[PDB]
Design a protein around this ligand. Sequence first.
Ligand SMILES: Cc1cc(Nc2cc(Br)cc(Br)c2)nc(N)[nH+]1
Lengths: 289, 271, 77
Amino acid sequence: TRINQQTECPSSVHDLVSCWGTDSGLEKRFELNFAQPVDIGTVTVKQLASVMERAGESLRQNSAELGIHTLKFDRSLLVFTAKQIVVRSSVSVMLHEAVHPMLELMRSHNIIVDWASFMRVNYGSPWDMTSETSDIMAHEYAELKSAFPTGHPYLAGPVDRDHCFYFVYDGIDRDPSSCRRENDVQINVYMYNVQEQQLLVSHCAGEYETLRVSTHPFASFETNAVSAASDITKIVNGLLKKFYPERVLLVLLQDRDAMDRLEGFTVVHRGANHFGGGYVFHQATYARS
Amino acid sequence: XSLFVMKDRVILITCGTITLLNCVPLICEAVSTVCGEVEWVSFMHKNYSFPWEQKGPHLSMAEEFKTLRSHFPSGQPFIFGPIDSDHYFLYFHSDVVQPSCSDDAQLSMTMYGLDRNQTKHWYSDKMLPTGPETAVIREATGLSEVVDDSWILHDLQYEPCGYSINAIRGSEYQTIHITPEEHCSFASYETNTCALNYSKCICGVLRVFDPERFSVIVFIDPDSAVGKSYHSGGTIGVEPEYYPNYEAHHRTVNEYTPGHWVLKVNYVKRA
Amino acid sequence: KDSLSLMAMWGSIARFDPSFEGPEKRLEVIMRVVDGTHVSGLLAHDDDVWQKVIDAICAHIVSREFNEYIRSYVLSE
Ligand SMILES: Cc1cc(Nc2cc(Br)cc(Br)c2)nc(N)[nH+]1
């Protein structure tokens, strides 16, 4: 039941998706970084709002704080600082439909995106053909590889278990005479089957802790505070007690310029992705004993 | 390809379109006759250069996973490295009831863009088993340096091109496979030697081929020589220092099962 | 096809120049030893047993060497 069809090679990744190719993720994340810090007021809320309409999201609330702009939509949360635009959303949100419009918004403002990521945390496995997970991920890959031909996708963890599929474009200029530095801190704590809200808490300018809780229930924590890097063990423990989930997924960023056991939790998988650009993305999945 | 049967395991290596998994039911029978029991099964393949030509359960990694799952349901699949660039696919199943001691080693290399002055010697208009003609090829290319006289070896020069060689010394093995077509150059090396540091072993292979890019993957066991070395901050021979003319592009570290680790690194030559 | 194999393909298309498949497939089966297991382990078998295995994938053995620890076979397509 298999013959050889002489077929053309798709010219673009979009031809491959349509020609040769419900959603079971838990959360999608889209981040952009810049070559030079951006003025916080340069990018209006109206412009960011209209860019998320392309992915079917209507702005509902937004607060302005020191070095931060927070936009709350129905199913997504958007933080905007001088260093990064980070938007996290539920899986019913086709966040890849906002990748290109977001990039155009940057270009109109002469803002150069030199680093970007698209991440989705999966409870399930894409190869489950009773689910649309795969087709969504093929579309995601189309918008990303179309926008970042130099970008690449990676899959951290077992494909059949809790894992992260993320795509990373790295266009950072590292000439010795360059002033672009990478001391970024990123810590993500995903908690499955906790025992609904979107929140941002800011303790310092340009630094935040976002918490998302939504439907199987789960809660999604993220922070970029330099203080958090010092005591990761303290903050995760405090998170597991308030929530008490069945399984946990940690992602720890060790940046270029700069988690062995959890209480009542056995390790399922752990590993790191050292990128050529010197930074590392550490991951570990745990399950309750 | 290569088959390595040992007192306690089987290692079957194949290239091309050969459907390697069809022999699993037979390997299980082979283990049952001797009254053994399967406790560890690993299927692994570097990302295919021409995935559209792979047949049977190998046309897609979802097929390889479905197939391997039909036989070993507990197993787990992994993908190390960039999925649209150099990467490895692993399916790993283990039924270790009795804790044991793991002192094994596995070193694998995959190389592309082989030295054009070398591809000349892997051509021949006739099939040649191990013979003086092949000895001319091992000296002429530098393989004699990788496989010294202290190894029992048998090699095969293909027609019109292609070179395979196997070597065994005690309980250690060594395998080289070469595709020399200029447009799709490729060479592979795998050994299970105990070594506190693979740098010399690896560079020995690189001098033979000097490829534009190559991937090295190391499987570290907890009770092996290099296992103790790695787990104590010591170098193991894959660090970028040992390859000045190469720039490390992406590296991966994974404890794919409790106590056992795998390291993969992708290198690319500089300008 | 699935999206991960789809990505793996686009990365091979971007490097396709008008071809033989070099990258290999590796299968490794390690067996447990119990009382009553042949003291020779899998080495108790004869070359007849492994020839039938290779036939299952439609290949053949060209040459064979061995020693007290391991049996080796070069295979051909
Ligand atoms: C056209 C052709 C055939 C061929 N044969 C072959 C088969 C096996 Br199994 C293992 C090895 Br190494 C080489 N090799 C190349 N490069 N081109």
